[PDB]
Scaffold this active site. Structure first.
Site, PDB file in Angstrom:
ATOM      1  N   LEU A   9       0.841  -1.183   0.000  1.00  0.00           N
ATOM      2  CA  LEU A   9       0.000   0.000   0.000  1.00  0.00           C
ATOM      3  C   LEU A   9       0.879   1.238   0.000  1.00  0.00           C
ATOM      4  O   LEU A   9       1.838   1.310   0.775  1.00  0.00           O
ATOM      5  CB  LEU A   9      -0.902   0.017   1.238  1.00  0.00           C
ATOM      6  N   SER A  10       0.539   2.205  -0.854  1.00  0.00           N
ATOM      7  CA  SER A  10       1.124   3.550  -0.820  1.00  0.00           C
ATOM      8  C   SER A  10       2.625   3.442  -1.047  1.00  0.00           C
ATOM      9  O   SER A  10       3.044   2.928  -2.100  1.00  0.00           O
ATOM     10  CB  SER A  10       0.709   4.220   0.498  1.00  0.00           C
ATOM     11  N   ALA A  11       3.467   3.915  -0.127  1.00  0.00           N
ATOM     12  CA  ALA A  11       4.904   3.758  -0.314  1.00  0.00           C
ATOM     13  C   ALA A  11       5.289   2.298  -0.549  1.00  0.00           C
ATOM     14  O   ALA A  11       6.251   2.016  -1.278  1.00  0.00           O
ATOM     15  CB  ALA A  11       5.651   4.321   0.899  1.00  0.00           C
TER      16      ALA A  11
END
Ligand SMILES: [Mg+2]
Length: 300
Positions: free
Chosen positions: A120-122
């Site tokens: 998720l995300s980074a």
């Protein structure tokens, strides 16, 4: 009923990671390994709790490793996806995450053809980096609300990339292909992204697909053309939840090589999942199940 175990270990380079070992693990059968890369501010337990990936691992008899990004490595416990030091094979966080896989392979029976990176995300952006730098290791990748390879190359440009996307995805796809070196191969990618994401704006989800179209098209050279034109698009609906659009990208051989799930009105969150963890939207489609199905049908 049947219960596995969730252990914490430290790889030789100091990388802490947690490992879910399903109850069906007996060492007689090499199991898939899903490497789950948590988002900013998260930690392995929180990401496990929200994604429910240990439940899927229990149900599907696979191993799940959660490398931990400590606050000492990034102020916000983000994988340093925007930093040149952490975008290449053999050094930095890509090396460390590959190191966790090697550590698990040494301690348990792992199916070398079914090792995956998702986040998720980074951690979605890092999963992109893992596919570009260690395609010999990772059969396929899952990118939850992430960014294309080298969407930024310094922290100074990271925020702009989150808001407005990275450079030309075809160019970034060439760089990801270069990063593969002699290990180059098609890496199937499944992308999830919320259309009301105000953290990593959805342009980034579109770019991930366009970047990997080029990278995977290039990895086939030296037979199988892949572009970023969706070959099958369908609207889906979650009962009493969100709607979403699925895009399927085939290669010329007829294989699904990439998939994009845009969840309507989702923010920056893992789609589906549980409120037991941060950064989930239980009203989205179940990214953990969808991603696992994509992975198991895309072995190395
Ligand atoms: Mg196509």
């Amino acid at each position: 009923g049947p219960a596995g175990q969730f252990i914490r270990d430290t790889a030789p380079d100091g990388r802490v990671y947690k490992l879910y070992i399903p109850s069906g693990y007996n060492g007689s059968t090499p199991l898939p390994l899903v490497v789950m890369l948590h988002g900013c501010t998260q930690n392995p337990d929180d990401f496990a709790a929200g994604t429910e990936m240990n439940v899927y691992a229990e149900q599907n008899n696979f191993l799940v490793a959660y490398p931990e990004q400590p606050s000492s490595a990034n102020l916000n416990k983000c994988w340093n996806w925007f930093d040149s030091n952490h975008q290449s094979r053999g050094r930095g966080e890509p090396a460390s995450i590959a190191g966790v896989v090697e550590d698990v392979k040494r301690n348990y029976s792992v199916d070398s053809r079914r090792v995956y990176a998702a986040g998720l995300s980074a951690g979605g952006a890092m999963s992109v980096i893992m596919g570009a730098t260690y395609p010999d290791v990772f059969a396929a990748i899952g990118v939850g609300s992430g960014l294309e390879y080298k969407a930024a190359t310094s922290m100074t440009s990271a925020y702009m990339a989150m808001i407005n996307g990275g450079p030309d995805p075809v160019q970034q796809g060439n760089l990801a292909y270069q990063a593969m070196g002699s290990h180059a191969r098609v890496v199937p990618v499944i992308v999830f992204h919320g259309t009301s994401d105000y953290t990593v704006y959805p342009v980034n989800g579109h770019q991930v697909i366009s970047q990997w179209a080029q990278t995977n098209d290039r990895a086939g050279d030296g037979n199988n053309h892949i572009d970023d034109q969706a070959d099958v698009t369908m609207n889906g609906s979650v009962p009493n939840g969100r709607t979403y659009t699925r895009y399927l990208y085939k290669d010329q051989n007829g294989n699904v090589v990439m998939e994009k799930i845009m969840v309507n009105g989702m923010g920056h969150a893992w789609s589906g999942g549980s409120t037991a963890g941060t950064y989930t939207d239980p009203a989205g489609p179940e990214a953990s199940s969808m991603m696992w199905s994509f992975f198991v049908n895309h072995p190395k």
